[PDB]
Paper text:
By using the [name] cytoskeleton as tracks, myosin also powers cellular cargo transport processes and can serve as a molecular anchor and force sensor. The myosin motor domain consists of four subdomains: the [name]-binding upper and lower 50 kDa (U50 and L50) domains, which are separated by the central [name]-binding cleft, the N-terminal domain, and the converter domain, containing the long α-helical extension known as the lever arm. The active site of myosin is located at the interface of the U50 domain and the N-terminal domain and is allosterically coupled to both the [name]-binding interface and the lever arm. This coupling ultimately enables the amplification of small rearrangements at the active site to large, force-producing conformational changes of the lever arm.
Numbering used by the authors:
A (entry chain A): 649 to 792
B (entry chain A): 433 to 504
C (entry chain A): 5 to 33, 36 to 54, 59 to 187, 191 to 216
D (entry chain B): 4 to 79, 86 to 97, 100 to 150
Amino acid sequence: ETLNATTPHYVRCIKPNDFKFPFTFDEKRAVQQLRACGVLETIRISAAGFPSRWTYQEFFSRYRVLMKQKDVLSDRKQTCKNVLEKLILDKDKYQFGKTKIFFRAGQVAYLEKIRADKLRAACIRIQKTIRGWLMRKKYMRMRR
Amino acid sequence: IGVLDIYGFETFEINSFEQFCINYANEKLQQQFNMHVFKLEQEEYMKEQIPWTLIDFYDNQPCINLIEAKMG
Amino acid sequence: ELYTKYARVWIPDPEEVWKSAELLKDYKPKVLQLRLEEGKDLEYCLDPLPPLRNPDILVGENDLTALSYLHEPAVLHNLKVRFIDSKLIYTYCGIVLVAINPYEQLPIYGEDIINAYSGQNMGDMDPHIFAVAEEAYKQMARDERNQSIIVSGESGAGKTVSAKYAMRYFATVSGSANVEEKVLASNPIMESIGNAKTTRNDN
Amino acid sequence: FNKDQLEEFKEAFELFDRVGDGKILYSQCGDVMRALGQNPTNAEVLKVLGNPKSDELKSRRVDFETFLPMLQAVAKYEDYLEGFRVFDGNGKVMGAELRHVLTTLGEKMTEEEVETVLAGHEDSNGCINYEAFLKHILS
Ligand SMILES: Nc1ncnc2c1ncn2[C@@H]1O[C@H](COP(=O)(O)OP(=O)(O)O)[C@@H](O)[C@H]1O
């Protein structure tokens, strides 16, 4: 009766180790604690839904490499609303809110994978051009 | 503003009436917690026009009823 | 479906609840060949999949729900690296603050940080108990509705010291000429009458 | 390749023969391909070289005639621009950031290659116009 008349904010405390060792951590206790705190259920339940929620401008700040200097629009909300549909064919993986993009679990890791592989392909282009220049330079010096 | 310092859910190589009370209190507190989280995310989905049916929550009322109801 | 050479997965272990593992041979839609710590030998029998692991840039984030793969390995890993490597003891899951006993003292509770948290929204800052106290103090203004901060955990987890700092926050930002002395001086009384040596721990 | 191209390329190749046997090392094959206007990756160079082992890469010597099929295979605008536009949106690229990523990602280069190619291309802020730098570095 005292608490339901109120609004809660929760703090869960967990004890790292039984031996009082300073600032060291035991997996086997900590997992027991994190189950007893209901944290793991909360995380599982969120994983069943749409865990990851990105503001469109943060999505741009992350995936500008994904989105072409041509394709970007006069607003980044619609820009990203298009670009993500380019990158992932089926909307069901994601949702478009008023303020955030909602993602099912894993789709962000996918976007980071394809982002990093494209960034390395760009680094391959630029490094290959500079390295080929040095090769040319020493080659023509030997010809000189 | 009120601050509550309460023992957590307990499990010991032996468990006795004291532990049974502690775990029943923690059942009640986590019922409150699960309802609060469920409310908060229905309200976020109304901020974001997303269907409620997607979200569900763990219901631990059957264990409260096991401990607390008549013939419990 | 993603599993390839140079993928990583978590595998169970009686010594530590999960081991990191390098996937050593591509998956084919029936038993997986894995590289590990300590050299490599495993083939791991799927039953009628191993938990699959977040890219290293994500791990160590301020919020366990900001991870891409959610599971007990990922959570345990984030908390372990933040605690051991970064010496950060506070973490968020959903709304829940999660606090881990550093179990030696820290600078972190200084009045400078108290002032740094005042007025900040809870996502504006790295997690700290003052961020929860501040959100409570905000919500009590935004609505007259009263606010409860529920500190919970095993005995010895640090519930009393967490309440101590949560009150020190209100008394610094709001407080003026005193509550703090009397409330903290009440603790030895309530601990004497109300605390006991249990089997697993004293106090 | 026509006779004129083959003759100029062979003459240059022989200029690179440091043993007098009319041959270069495998590790120079890529250098020769790049000097002739091609831009193959190190992976592509090793592939056309047959992914040689350390010993033959450092000491086995090949004449122009064995190099030639590989040069041919390697030999056969918007992508270069987008590759630089990755790091753009005022049309500039940090010299420090470009240096770090080129020396730490991909087929990592030395700091001296990057300093050499970047010389004269950065402005007072330490920003490089990458469209001009790209046209310059592709010639
Ligand atoms: N955040 C913290 N910083 C420094 N020391 C701590 C912290 N939390 C707990 N401790 C240490 O751990 C001890 C046990 O925690 P305490 O809160 O006293 O027990 P309980 O949580 O059971 O009431 C404290 O007395 C203190 O010595």
